[PDB]
Design a protein around this ligand. Structure first.
Ligand SMILES: N[C@H]1[C@@H](OP(=O)(O)O)O[C@H](CO[C@@H]2O[C@H](CO[C@]3(C(=O)O)C[C@@H](O[C@]4(C(=O)O)C[C@@H](O)[C@@H](O)[C@@H]([C@H](O)CO[C@]5(C(=O)O)C[C@@H](O)[C@@H](O)[C@@H]([C@H](O)CO)O5)O4)[C@@H](O)[C@@H]([C@H](O)CO)O3)[C@@H](OP(=O)(O)O)[C@H](O)[C@H]2N)[C@@H](O)[C@@H]1O
Ligand SMILES: *[C@@H]1O[C@H](CO[C@@H]2O[C@@H](C)[C@@H](O)[C@@H](O)[C@@H]2O)[C@@H](O)[C@H](O)[C@H]1NC(C)=O
Ligand code: CL
Lengths: 216, 213
């Protein structure tokens, strides 16, 4: 099979800067009919992939002229002359010259922006849930940059790994921020034993951990 | 416009087969080939096969022994069948047109999310998330469902801005997610805020008003 090696895997770029993504094929990719079927795709968060560039260098219908493609042999490049907010997502190269047709591993374009501190909110179990015998405590950490953040849960100070579930949104197109949710799941009986529940967050923006909590 | 409309199951038992129908509008299947591609977190994007305009096929040899693609040109339908699915065949399956030369019909179907698992279909529990005692963040916890997906909206779509619906994660072999909404502190509880959760797999539709305390 033709291996398609895509670099870099992660591409942080400022709005308006140039960006280029490289795709290296392990063999030449000229089809028997003469065409080099090298395509570039963008997959925006939540969407199907969309074609940007076909036969190496041809812009697909409706694609902005800031995108362009080049290369030959085993070396191909996608260039974005100036990156816009809507360009964020994962870019893939694809060869359809030799069966089996194959994709690159993907390049995640990330938009650089100024540091933004998370808005942290903590939520006790609902009365509805408690009636049913469970107890989840939810913590939202919203609209922060950069993406790396650490959350820790304390129940009356004792550190809790068990039953902590974390989830992150993809980069937000409108302000280039990330969001995170962290849910601590307990039994109602265990929840009813303690008073103090703490959602603790460390992020580049603050040297002192961001602490939100409540009392039962 | 060009549209590729897929239909197929969301949940498949291990060792059972997966059948998807792709209905094409906007171009002739007598003229253009249609491809099948899947996407998984484990294996990325994988091309599975193609059915060319005259009906010949090429398949990916890693799948050929259990894969069939056939079509009916007069109904503009393409039929994908893969047998003996394992848990790691869990993926979004797409029909598409790609690898174009001179035409402009390079479009993808919406995708069919297929979970391969013996676990039973389970509805979500939907719980309102209100604060404990400038802007105020509210939420919905959508807990303990199977399989993916659900959809979440706030006041039936009217709250778009300041919403974050988080990817589902697995706990106790079921999915849990949350969604947050951020409205101005003046506006709540004075104006109502409600999440609308749908989980088609279990015929669940729940509306949960977020009430204080
Ligand atoms: N000089 C060419 C000519 O030679 P002959 O006049 O001596 O035969 O044609 C040769 C191939 O024989 C013709 O086969 C077609 C039917 O083709 C297919 C089928 O449709 O089922 C597909 C064939 O697969 C190839 C191929 O081997 O030619 C390679 C594929 O990778 C792919 O590239 C396909 C098509 O060309 C793809 O078509 C599209 C597309 O889907 O993307 C759509 C087209 O409209 C057009 O846009 C093309 C582009 O121009 C790119 O080519 O893209 O071709 C192959 O599997 C054959 C099978 O071997 C035949 O059994 O089936 C016959 O047409 P129909 O019977 O009317 O369907 C035709 O009559 C045959 N001559 C070619 O190889 C020579 O180079
Ligand atoms: C996981 O997938 C296995 C087969 O995957 C395919 O074949 C293996 C040998 C590798 O070459 C891989 O790259 C291919 O995608 C199954 O045999 C196995 O049962 C699957 N396991 C689970 C848990 O689903
Ligand atoms: Cl922009």
């Amino acid at each position: 099979d033709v291996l398609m090696t895509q670099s870099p895997l992660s591409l942080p770029v400022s709005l308006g800067d140039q960006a280029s993504i490289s795709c290296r094929s392990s063999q030449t990719i000229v089809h028997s009919n003469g065409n080099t079927y090298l395509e570039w795709y963008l997959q925006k968060p939540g969407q199907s992939p969309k074609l940007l560039i076909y036969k190496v260098s041809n812009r697909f219908y409706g694609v902005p002229d800031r995108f362009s493609g080049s290369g030959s042999g085993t070396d191909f490049t996608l260039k974005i002359s100036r990156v816009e907010a809507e360009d964020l997502g994962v870019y893939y190269c694809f060869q359809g010259s030799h069966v089996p047709y194959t994709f690159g591993g993907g390049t995640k374009l990330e938009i650089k922006r100024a540091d933004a501190a998370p808005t942290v909110s903590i939520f006790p179990p609902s009365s509805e849930q408690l009636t049913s015998g469970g107890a989840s405590v939810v913590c939202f950490l919203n609209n922060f940059y950069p993406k790396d953040i650490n959350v820790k849960w304390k129940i009356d100070g004792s550190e809790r790994q068990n039953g902590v579930l974390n989830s992150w949104t993809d980069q937000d197109s409108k302000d280039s921020t990330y969001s995170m949710s962290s849910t601590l799941t307990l039994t109602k009986d265990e929840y009813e034993r303690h008073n103090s529940y703490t959602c603790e967050a460390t992020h580049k923006t603050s040297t002192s951990p961001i602490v939100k909590s409540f009392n039962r | 416009q060009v549209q590729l409309v897929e239909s197929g199951p969301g949940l498949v038992q291990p060792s059972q087969s997966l059948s998807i129908t792709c209905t094409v509008s906007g171009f002739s299947l007598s003229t253009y080939g249609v491809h099948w591609v899947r996407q998984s977190p484990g294996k990325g994007l994988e091309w599975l096969g193609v059915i060319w305009s005259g009906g010949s096929t090429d398949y990916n040899a890693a799948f050929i022994s259990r894969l069939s693609i056939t079509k009916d040109n007069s109904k503009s339908q393409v039929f994908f069948k893969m047998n003996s699915l394992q848990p790691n065949d869990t993926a979004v399956y797409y029909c598409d047109r790609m690898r174009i030369t001179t035409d402009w019909f390079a479009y993808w179907g919406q995708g069919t999310l297929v979970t391969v698992s013996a676990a039973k279909t389970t509805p979500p529990s939907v719980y309102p998330l209100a604060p404990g005692s400038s802007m105020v963040t509210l939420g919905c916890l959508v807990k303990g469902y199977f399989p993916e997906p659900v959809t979440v909206t706030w006041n039936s779509g009217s709250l778009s801005s300041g919403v974050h619906t988080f990817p589902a994660v697995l706990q106790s072999d079921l999915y849990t997610l949350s969604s947050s909404v951020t409205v101005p502190s003046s506006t709540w509880p004075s104006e109502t805020v409600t999440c609308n959760v749908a989980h088609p797999a279990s015929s669940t539709k729940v509306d949960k008003k977020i009430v204080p305390r």
